[PDB]
Design a protein around this ligand. Structure first.
Ligand SMILES: [Mg+2]
Ligand SMILES: [Mg+2]
Lengths: 443, 443, 233
């Protein structure tokens, strides 16, 4: 069933014999943070909350320890899909409050909640169904992660068929046992790459599921002897892993985007919503692609989009409109990758789209041709912009973006840039083995 | 002695029993190209020249065979510093001519010659003595180049002392036997790094010597069991290899930089010459640093300069003025690295310097403080610009500079950009092992 | 004490090993044992004072004052092994300067924002290798002496001490913990307060055991010296 009250949560713990409760939250950079609580402490925790070191939220750039209180949310209680011999294990989420009682504005969850509240002012609510892609490599003799492939299958192939097939089935069953209500799961284009699709739901609920999904899959692979990786591009010459985001705005219980009277069956609001996304997508690209490796995926020649355009039939466009209509009307953004922070990513997508609706931003003519096959003069003639080439370029764009700072708040804005800035500086000074293979003999 | 005429060259060949003659020239990208000629063919070659595939000058971007004729220059004849049992070996240089008789404008040597003529129009001549730095690594069991250090010495250290010491001495003796007139040779800051200072001499002769110097040292190291490398940054965490250039302008047989009546003992022309270099240095930075690895060396925290400034006492400044005065007055530019093309690098340095003198560009106030210790606001307040961060940024700067296009000519300009552009695109899509170490387990 | 061998026994039977070294690896944070403490009289916390701006009683100020005055003397007890002082180096969460603060965390003594019955004082110097009986006993005795003598703790340090200069530290009068085990023994060896608290028998025995241990360590040639000096000299 679904637990809504602390009394129901306590009854479930006693009934199913849950021994440990794990909190769940994410830092600014998207890493999943958690700590354990004994089952006996749960009743007191609901009454007064838990004090913890909140400097972990600010990432690995923390300097001074700061204390603030976490208040648990009973509606987010759920039981993890593995049964140790000792007893059951369950997780829970909550809100972060400063000692003075004010909510902490640096929490990525709070950022999304403000965005939801902003949409509520206009009477809109958003549903998101994301498509998550990941790899399944082999472990070495020491159990460390590797990049050894498990099968040479292709798109939608009936692979794997060896014992790795049971591992994949266990992941699907475990997610269903948690009530995620998966739509479909299939092999992807690259070898040993798989994709899992989510049903539509409230954006807040979906974001929590995505965070839970990540460490659930990783835990299962270890106990079966494999490893699940979420790198945007772990291998060269094969397709990368992305997290497309199908999204829709609901007002008064009906889909805003759908419009039977238009030739494209899309409402005027949907045109503005796309226009807002196109205008600002360049600014917050760093949030959707946070790590350096994400830009090894955004290169021409694969399914990854690198040009800013929208289309109804073409797939190379950054924004794609699926042929489904009615309540299923949706907009798919193909830039993000699983390494992104779902809370920050969705919040910016919602805020950027709403701004376009308010300002009646025109999305322009759709691009129904192959942009890659075109020439630079044609792209210049058509005014087709491109996404940032590297992480440093993305930071420079984000940094001066007034809109991004307003949406994310000052505290998150400054902390996010500093962490990324330090990461890029370390990477730019490394001498990669590719240079040695190319320049040692030549020079 | 010095050979002047073809009769003298032929007499020397017969006297010293030279069996093979090797032509010498470089392509646009700086690679050394050569082919062999039997001694008997030499007399015919002097009379009519040698037909050869001239498409090799255009680099590895060549598409179609094209025939140009090389007219040998007797004044460049020299004998290589090794004695095969069969007989002696000699090298020679010459000019490239199109079949219709017009000189080929794509030759890097011709680019420098045009620059000299432009300087000669103002009555000036240039003398350049460079300081070349290189490493000395061990060879594996198969003779392939590797990166194992031969000693852990430091700056000016009396190292190495093992059998590698004899190899180092052999290089010095061989160069002296060539008539190079080496100034001084010493150990450098990084382990197994050495530096050799060339005699302060004419620019045209110096450029040919630098090209000859590179393959002479490499050949000696192989036959002694070691390997000499010219990578701008072969190891991480240690100093890179650079090629500082000291240049001076002479009019009517006297140095024009030296002014006894000024407090700094520098003439007004020298100030303008520095001003021209500072203005245009950003544009042709790609020529001085042509490979991707060059920009790994150009990072803060080492001897490499990354800020556009000039000083008299400071070292981190891009342009340094040595305390020597009088006839030895000189200006040192510290940006280039040994991987650069000496013909193109010197030619642009001359043309940029003259343009400052012609237009009377003020170099501004010198920077006597440590720039690295200053803050970004201070640098913004002081208006201190920085060199391009990576090869892609340098290409973008150099691709719009009309001054570089005018100096290098249309043919060299277009070919150089395309070759670098293709090289960068290949590098930007690689997944380096550093990314795997950082991201495979975290994500 | 029970916790230590319980964890170690479990790890063995599962195939792993649990270590309590104050600094087992170089370049990463060490393991410390912070000690939150509070004093209760008549069933009520004595540190909490609702009438003060910092919600701290006058006794709490004296208790901190006593700890700061004597912390240098019994530092050896809290950090009993040689490895303990590899952890006490600048650049990590370990404190190496004697100060107290409310918001800063690098301070030796940190006061958590919790108030009321949960008011507590955290000392961040000890490490798990210390003897809990001796460490707590000295920690209690030092605090009581401050309360009895009304030692003023001085102004708190709300700035980052590591970022300050030596002249600033000299101007502010900020002391530092002993650098190595030998320095700590010299301080603890002339301290009459430590001798009085621990008793004559424990005092003499503890010093001799540590003294012999340090002497053995100071005469070893570590492989780090060979790497740096064998080729250079
Ligand atoms: Mg897919
Ligand atoms: Mg040098």
């Amino acid at each position: 069933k679904k637990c809504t009250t602390k009394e129901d949560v306590l009854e479930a713990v006693k009934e199913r014999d849950v021994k440990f409760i794990r909190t769940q939250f994410t830092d600014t950079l998207g890493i999943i943070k958690s700590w354990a609580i004994p089952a006996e402490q749960l009743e007191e925790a609901f009454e007064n909350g838990v004090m913890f070191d909140g400097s972990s939220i600010q990432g690995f750039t923390r300097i001074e320890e700061s204390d603030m209180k976490l208040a648990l949310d009973p509606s987010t209680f759920r039981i993890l899909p593995w049964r140790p011999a000792t007893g059951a294990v369950a997780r829970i989420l909550g809100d972060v409050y400063l000692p003075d009682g004010n909510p902490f504005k640096g929490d990525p969850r709070y950022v999304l909640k403000t965005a939801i509240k902003e949409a509520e002012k206009m009477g809109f609510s958003m549903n998101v169904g994301p498509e998550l892609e990941f790899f399944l490599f082999k472990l070495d003799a020491n159990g460390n992660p590797t990049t050894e492939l498990t099968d040479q299958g292709g798109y939608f192939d009936f692979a794997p068929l060896d014992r790795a097939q049971d591992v994949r089935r266990d992941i699907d069953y475990a997610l269903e046992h948690m009530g995620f209500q998966i739509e479909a799961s299939h092999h992807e284009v690259a070898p040993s790459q798989h994709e899992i699709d989510f049903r539509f739901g409230d954006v807040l609920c979906t974001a929590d599921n995505v965070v839970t999904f990540k460490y659930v899959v990783k835990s299962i692979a270890y106990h079966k002897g494999y490893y699940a990786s979420f790198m945007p591009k772990p291998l060269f010459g094969v397709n990368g892993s992305g997290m497309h985001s199908n999204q829709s705005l609901f007002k008064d219980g009906k889909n805003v985007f759908y419009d039977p009277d238009t030739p494209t069956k899309l409402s005027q609001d949907a045109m503005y919503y796309i226009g807002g996304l196109l205008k600002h997508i360049r600014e917050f690209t760093a949030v959707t692609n946070p790590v350096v490796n994400s830009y090894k995926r955004l290169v021409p020649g694969y399914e990854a989009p690198v040009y800013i355009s929208w289309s109804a039939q073409n797939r190379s466009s950054l924004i794609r409109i699926p042929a489904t209509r009615g309540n299923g009307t949706r907009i798919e953004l193909r830039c993000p990758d699983p390494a992104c922070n779902p809370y920050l990513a969705f919040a910016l997508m919602l805020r950027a789209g709403l701004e376009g609706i308010k300002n009646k931003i025109d999305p322009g003519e759709p691009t129904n041709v192959n942009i890659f096959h075109l020439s630079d003069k044609e792209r210049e003639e058509r005014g087709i912009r491109s996404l940032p080439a590297d992480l440093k370029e993305a930071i420079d764009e984000m940094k001066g973006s007034k809109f991004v700072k307003e949406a994310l708040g000052e505290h998150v804005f400054s902390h996010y840039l500093c962490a990324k800035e330090m990461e890029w500086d370390e990477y730019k000074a490394v001498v990669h083995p590719w240079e040695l293979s190319r320049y040692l003999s030549m020079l």
